[PDB]
Amino acid sequence: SVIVYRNNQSTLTLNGYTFQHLYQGAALVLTPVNAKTARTNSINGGVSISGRVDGGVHTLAIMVQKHSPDDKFLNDAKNSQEPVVFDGSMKRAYTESGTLKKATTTLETGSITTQPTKTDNNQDPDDSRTYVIEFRNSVETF
């Protein structure tokens, strides 16, 4: 249908801190690690539907500037003595036809799960710190 967004990228904020230095070129990405329901399927038109406990478990890959307030926050999170839970939201504003709706996706208790692969070059500039915060519930609503 007809649709247009404000807010170029999904504005994002974890622990009441908003990410504002996002590496241009598809920084955020949400990946469902698992299915939403596994099934066992028996003879003659019979199946069994069971929503797994890993339903919303989503990994969020974030790309941030090599040394930025956003990378400072994520790094201080990474180096904490006790791994810091992450709660927050990814959301966009968008006007459906004329009506203004907001598409939000909560992010429950999550944590670091892959450190950035810290690469420094000389040929070419590279400021690409990619964290992956993988939560358990990522419910989009709209």
Partner: protein
């Protein structure tokens, strides 16, 4: 249709910049007085579609054929102050002012992708000319007076 004019509007009152100094594209328009820094919304980039929606309305009964698409519209700044009107745009594109003024322009606005100071061969002289790239995404629509179905009579048969 209206998309290029809309992005022209957005650049018109993001830079607080003049009517007569924004010309569109590869139309016919003379660039007199090189220093008069123009801005042109080059739309020559191929616009490619993404989806073809089709919605339907019940009471004021008509329906709604939509087509989301995107185009790599480039911006060419001219004039002695080309560089500034490049950078100052290439950087205010993602502020309050822009994101607050593009209210009803039925047109998303992505980040500026790349820039270039490719000038133009003005005949044994070089006039300032800078391109900045950014994909723009919008969705034209049309409405058609179809009509709904209130019931459905029918018959069955069996052996």
């Amino acid at each position: 249709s209206q998309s290029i004019i809309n992005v022209a509007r957005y650049i018109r009152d993001l830079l607080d910049y003049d009517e007569n100094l924004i010309q569109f594209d590869r139309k016919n328009t003379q660039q007199s007085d090189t220093v008069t820094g123009y801005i042109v919304v080059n739309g020559s980039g191929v616009q490619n579609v993404l989806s073809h929606g089709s919605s339907y309305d019940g009471d004021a009964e008509i329906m709604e054929y939509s087509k989301s698409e995107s185009r790599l519209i480039t911006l060419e700044f001219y004039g002695s102050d080309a560089y500034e009107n490049a950078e100052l745009f290439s950087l205010l594109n993602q502020s309050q002012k822009a994101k607050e003024v593009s209210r009803g322009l039925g047109l998303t606005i992505y980040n500026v992708s790349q820039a270039t100071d490719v000038k133009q061969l003005l005949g044994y002289q070089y006039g300032n000319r800078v391109h900045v790239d950014f994909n723009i995404q919008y969705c034209p629509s049309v409405y058609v007076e179809t009509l709904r179905v209130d019931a459905s009579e029918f018959e069955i048969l069996v052996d």
